């Protein structure tokens, strides 16, 4: 029951899906723009 | 980074053989690192966690998922015989 | 990123029409563009999110003596794409000269759609080689595109002019167009009309409607090649990455077409790999050796299957190798598309750089050499005379295609520190 | 390992057609090659695992004045085998000269299929001796095969030219072909046309369709002989092991055919052994003594039955012995094939080296000697004159077959430290 209501609210699978997508298409484009530094520059490129 | 540095370029036609001579090597390595480890071991790991009904085993299957991908993509020890080669072909 | 597709000529507008209809049926859109409820994807590669809730494709509609383009006009897929840029034969010189005198406003049409999308990856040209309508205008527009924009990619889906054929200026037209293809393009995808004709007369018993069925084949191939861009993967979500491995040098940029089912009208990766490597599941029909092959598969793929299949492909040696280096068949995995028919659930296609296309080139060169030696098959076309009274462009194109054949044969050698 | 089967001439293409149809019905394949659900076996001996999921046999299709080969063309078994290598009489000299002038591309056809399979064990020639169409071309191709590849085996399934026969050059043709058979072959399987004709007119009451029924017999024998290769046993899963025991020396390589049911249209090993040893269950009809016999049995064999049967065969002495050594009838056991008709559940066949075939050889030599002494039966064939104006090849073949008869009679002796 506890594991059931952990996958219907506070879904660990959701955070897992986000995790392994914040490395490896989209994060390619973000880093290739940096190819052409600074730590506050990265925040504003990342939020774009 | 190494793949995009080798894939941005637009002697004579001779530079382009040197392009293939390195670009193939990094491309095959990239295919290995993703598919054979980070997606194979991921695909078994999902089918394991969806049948965990316990608090305790859920931590353990996760640690035994990271620590084997951390072995297969090696960082645990022998970074003076595996890591250095990858580092110097980055300078290539 | 985003691809702007250009279609011109009757054959080119035909294949663009069937390709747009194929992508309309594939993605979740109506022929008006009405959104469906089932649509990891992308709908911004060929499609603009356009401004009446129709994902209107960025397509340049060009007509030259329109007959089938009129049928494209009164059609339910004319509510999918029409940014209203339609602007007005049987020869390369006529189409070239007609494209020359009006390059300005059609370049403004190109500029309008270039301003239309936020990003750009390449220009895909729906083209027919020595098709009359596509010919000449296509070569001139190829010169305009590669000169005006040196920072982007140019792709040309091309047929090889052999349809069991009367036009005797066709080798001259194909030779001049091939000169433009070698010099003014980054990559060329070439198919054989006779090969697709043989495959069509094989799988069915059709003899008369061969054109429309060939259109089905090329549209399926064009959807299959850009599935990895339209659906987000890990690599070849841009064109240049797929273009990079097969092309080792700016002269060898001509790619063979393969696709392992010839059928859509159980299976594993291992069987379709060995079924792909024969030259009679290739839709383009001495030592002949591939430069580089790349295969992309889409289906219910077990990830161990590609691994041991590539094992079997190695120790069997059923693929032709490259002497001067490693550049081999690469396994790529893509997503199975929604609303595609459920036959051949594991289905793969290949794009490959082979030296065997040099044989087809020198065959057409031999036909040109025959008609050029006889000097009775220029027919004295007036646009051909007025365009070049000395006809030295035919000699220059012959020199360029001869250098191309020599570079092909030099790449065949174990030394490619010997050039041509 | 893998066997590449060669068929040539109208009679040779006839027996190859019936043999391929027999193996198609035997193994789990359609006449297209579609896999069945019931198929310890092997399907890689005569069959390539070919590239449209049809187990297409590696067969060289040769035609010379085709009449029945046209009927082979429009047939459902033309979807089983056709690697598209068909390339174009009544004399040995004509077929020899016609094969001589075009040896290059047919050798390229041989090279194509030699590159086709991964391994090779031998070349089985569907051949007819003095059949006109098969004759001459078969002898020339035998010279080409044994000269070009000295590392492989050459097998020739051959008939003995006596069909109760008009052709009077037939002894000359058979004599020249027999010279080639003795000198350019590793092993020859010989049958008698008159023996199979007698057996066919015995078991049925057919007089006119004797050819087709003889084709059934030789195809059944050819399937029965290679059952031990096609189904994995312990020995004679390669050709050379079965070839080894019967052939004691390179001159005596001619093997008699036996098969103990003459019927397929309860039983034990003991009865079929004693039924096999008579010379009237042999399908090839002074002291005459076998060199070596080998029998292969297939069925529901109790393993004690072969043991006590061989006991009975010893103390009865119903087989002809070898003086100079031990070389006797050997019991081999093979698997009963799937989808074979359930008559004679315990069924065996034999291959044997007998000196009695020397009698048939000297009979045909006597016919040649008669027509050669009379000098009225060369008929002045123009290819025979132009091929050899002096006709010394007939004398050389006569010398070789005389040495063969002398070596046969010397092997008959208790001393074979006396040669010929």
How many cross-chain Cβ pairs, C to D, lie less than 8 Å apart? 5
Which residues touch D121 (CB under 8 Å, ≥6 apart)?
D1, D2, D3, D152, D153, D229, D238, D239, D240
Cα(D11)–Cα(C413) distance, rounded to whole angstroms? 47
Q: What is the 3-state secondary structure (H, E, C) of D362-398?
A: HHHHHHHHHHHHHCCCCCCCHHHHHHCCCCHHHHHHH
What the block records as the tokens of D393 is: 């090849």
Contacts of C251 in chain B (CB under 8 A): 13
Cα(C368)–Cα(C377) distance, rounded to whole angstroms? 10
Tell which of C119, C236, C237 to mutate to test the A interface (max A CBs under 10 Å): C237
C-beta separation of D139 from D21 below 8 A: no
**Residues on C contacting D at a C-beta cutoff of 8 Å:** 274-275, 278, 280-281
- Rounded to 5°, angle at Cα A18 from A13 and A23: 130
Cα(C360)–Cα(C370) distance, rounded to whole angstroms? 15
| Start-to-end C-alpha separation, chain C | 35
- Rounded to 5°, angle at Cα C405 from C154 and C420: 95
Q: How far is CA C410 from CA B16, C169, C289, D237, in A?
A: 15, 30, 12, 46
- Of C98, C156, C101, which is closest to residue C124 (Cα–Cα)? C156
CB atoms within 10 A of CB C323: 13
Cα(D179)–Cα(D201) distance, rounded to whole angstroms? 32
C-beta separation of C215 from C225 below 8 A: no
**Residues on D contacting C at a C-beta cutoff of 8 Å:** 51
* Virtual torsion, Cα D265, D271, D274, D275, nearest 10 deg: -10
Compare all CA atoms of chain B with the CA of C152 and give the residue at the minimum distance.
B10
Beta bridge partners of D254: D188
C-beta separation of D409 from D359 below 8 A: no
- Of C267, C282, C414, which is closest to residue C352 (Cα–Cα)? C282
Encode C140-158: b = buried (16+ Cβ within 10 Å), e = exposed: bbbbbbbeeeeebbbbbbb
Which residues touch B83 (CB under 8 Å, ≥6 apart)?
B74, B75
CB atoms within 10 A of CB A39: 6
DSSP C181: H
Which residues touch C419 (CB under 8 Å, ≥6 apart)?
B12, B13, C407, C410
Alpha helices in C317-380 (DSSP H): 357-374
- Rounded to 5°, angle at Cα C377 from C376 and C380: 90
What the block records as the tokens of C279 is: 């030259």
DSSP B39: I
Cα(C98)–Cα(C103) distance, rounded to whole angstroms? 9
A32 in contact with C at a CB cutoff of 8 Å? Answer: no
CB atoms within 10 A of CB D382: 11
Whether the CA torsion C7, C10, C13, C14 is positive or negative: it is negative
Cα(D279)–Cα(C392) distance, rounded to whole angstroms? 86
Whether the CA torsion C294, C295, C301, C302 is positive or negative: it is negative
Contact call for C245 and B27, based on CB within 8 A: yes
Contacts of D51 in chain C (CB under 8 A): 274-275, 278, 280-281
DSSP D78: G
Cα(D352)–Cα(D283) distance, rounded to whole angstroms? 12
Contact call for B4 and A35, based on CB within 8 A: yes
Contact call for C237 and A25, based on CB within 8 A: yes
Cα(B57)–Cα(C346) distance, rounded to whole angstroms? 36
Phi-psi region of C379 (alpha: psi -120 to 50; beta: other; left: phi over 0): left
B27 in contact with C at a CB cutoff of 8 Å? Answer: yes
Contacts of B34 in chain C (CB under 8 A): 234
C-beta separation of D24 from D78 below 8 A: no
- Determine the 3-state secondary structure of D322 from DSSP: coil
The method of structure determination was cryo-EM
Alpha helices in D64-123 (DSSP H): 68-73, 92-101, 103-116
Size of chain C in residues: 420
Which residues touch A23 (CB under 8 Å, ≥6 apart)?
none
What the block records as the tokens of D389 is: 């104006």
Cα(C184)–Cα(C143) distance, rounded to whole angstroms? 6
C-beta separation of C215 from C14 below 8 A: yes
HSE-CB for C360 with a 13 A CA cutoff: 20
Compare all CA atoms of chain B with the CA of A27 and give the residue at the minimum distance.
B1
Cα(D412)–Cα(D414) distance, rounded to whole angstroms? 7
Q: What is the 3-state secondary structure (H, E, C) of C290-302?
A: EEEEEEEEECCCC
Q: Give the H/E segment covering residue C116.
A: helix C103-116
Q: Residue D155 — φ and ψ, nearest 5°?
A: -115, 140
- Of D74, D6, D42, which is closest to residue D230 (Cα–Cα)? D42
HSE-CB for C149 with a 13 A CA cutoff: 17
What the block records as the tokens of C116 is: 């239309």
Contacts of C233 in chain A (CB under 8 A): 25
Tell me the pairing of strands D153-160 and D187-192: parallel
Contact call for B21 and C325, based on CB within 8 A: yes
C-beta separation of D120 from D1 below 8 A: yes
- Of D158, D81, D84, D99, which is closest to residue D126 (Cα–Cα)? D158
Whether the CA torsion C375, C376, C378, C381 is positive or negative: it is positive
Resolution in A: 7.1
Chain C: nearest CA to B39, how far in angstroms? 8
Compare all CA atoms of chain B with the CA of A3 and give the residue at the minimum distance.
B53
Cα(C127)–Cα(C15) distance, rounded to whole angstroms? 9
* Virtual torsion, Cα C364, C369, C375, C381, nearest 10 deg: 40
DSSP D140-152: HHHHHHHHH-SSS
Size of chain A in residues: 48
Q: Which chains touch A (3 or more CB pairs under 8 A)?
A: B, C
Q: Give the H/E segment covering residue C26.
A: helix C10-26
DSSP D191-220: EEHHHHHHHHHHHS--SS-HHHHHHHHHHH
Q: Which chains touch C (3 or more CB pairs under 8 A)?
A: A, B, D
What the block records as the tokens of D229 is: 């290769």
What the block records as the tokens of B10 is: 């637009």
Confirm whether residue C135 is marked as ligand binding.
Answer: yes
Q: What is the 3-state secondary structure (H, E, C) of C201-236?
A: HHHCCCCCCHHHHHHHHHHHHHHHHCHHHHCCCCCC
A24 in contact with C at a CB cutoff of 8 Å? Answer: yes
């Amino acid at each position: 029951n506890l594991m059931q209501t952990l996958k219907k609210d506070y879904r660990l699978v959701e955070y897992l899906q986000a995790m392994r997508n914040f490395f490896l298409d989209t994060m390619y484009d973000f880093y290739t723009s940096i190819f052409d530094q600074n730590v506050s520059f990265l925040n504003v490129q990342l939020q774009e | 980074w190494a793949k995009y540095s080798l894939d941005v370029l637009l002697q004579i036609h001779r530079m382009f053989l040197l392009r293939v001579k390195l670009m193939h090597f990094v491309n095959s390595l990239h295919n290995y690192i993703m598919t054979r480890i980070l997606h194979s071991t991921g695909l078994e790991f999902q089918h394991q966690v969806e049948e965990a009904k316990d608090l305790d085993q859920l931590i353990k299957i996760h640690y035994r998922y990271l620590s084997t991908i951390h072995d297969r993509c090696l960082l645990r020890e022998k970074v003076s015989f595996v890591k250095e080669a990858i580092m110097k072909v980055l300078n290539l | 990123r985003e691809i702007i597709t250009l279609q011109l000529g009757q054959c080119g507008n035909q294949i663009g029409f069937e390709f747009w209809k194929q992508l309309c049926a594939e993605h979740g859109i109506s022929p008006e563009g009405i959104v469906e409820e089932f649509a990891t994807d992308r709908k911004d590669v060929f499609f603009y999110q356009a401004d009446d809730e129709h994902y209107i494709p960025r397509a340049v509609l060009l007509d030259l003596e329109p007959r089938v383009i009129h049928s494209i006009l009164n059609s339910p897929y004319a509510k999918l794409y029409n940014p209203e840029n339609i602007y007005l034969g049987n020869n390369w010189a006529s189409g070239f000269s007609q494209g020359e005198k009006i390059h300005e406003d059609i370049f403004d049409i190109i500029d309008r759609e270039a301003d239309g999308s936020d990003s750009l990856e390449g220009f895909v040209l729906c083209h027919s080689i020595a098709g009359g309508t596509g010919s000449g205008l296509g070569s001139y527009l190829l010169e305009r595109l590669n000169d005006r924009y040196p920072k982007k990619l140019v792709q040309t889906y091309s047929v090889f002019p052999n349809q069991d054929e009367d036009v005797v200026v066709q080798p001259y037209n194909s030779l001049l167009t091939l000169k433009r293809l070698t010099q003014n393009a980054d990559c060329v995808v070439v198919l054989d009309n006779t090969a697709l004709n043989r495959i069509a007369t094989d799988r069915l018993h059709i003899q008369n409607p061969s054109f429309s069925q060939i259109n089905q084949l090329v549209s399926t191939i064009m959807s299959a090649s850009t599935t990895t861009l339209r659906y987000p993967g890990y690599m070849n979500n841009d064109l240049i990455g797929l273009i990079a491995s097969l092309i080792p040098t700016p002269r060898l940029h001509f790619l063979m077409t393969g696709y392992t089912p010839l059928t859509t009208d159980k299976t594993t990766v291992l069987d379709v790999m060995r079924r792909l490597l024969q030259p009679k599941n290739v839709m383009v029909s001495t030592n002949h050796c591939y430069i580089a092959i790349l295969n992309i598969i889409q289906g219910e793929v077990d990830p161990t299957q590609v691994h041991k299949s590539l094992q079997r492909i190695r120790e069997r040696k059923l693929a032709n190798f490259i002497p001067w280096g490693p550049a081999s068949i690469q396994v790529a995995l893509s997503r199975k598309s929604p609303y595609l028919p459920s036959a051949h659930r594991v289905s793969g296609l290949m794009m490959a750089n082979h030296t065997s296309i040099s044989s087809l080139f020198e065959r057409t060169c031999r036909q040109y050499d025959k008609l050029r030696k006889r000097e009775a098959f220029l027919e004295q076309f007036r646009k051909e005379d007025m365009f070049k009274d000395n006809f030295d462009e035919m000699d220059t194109s012959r020199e360029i295609v001869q250098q191309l054949i020599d570079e092909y044969h030099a790449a065949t050698r174990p030394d490619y520190i010997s050039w041509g």
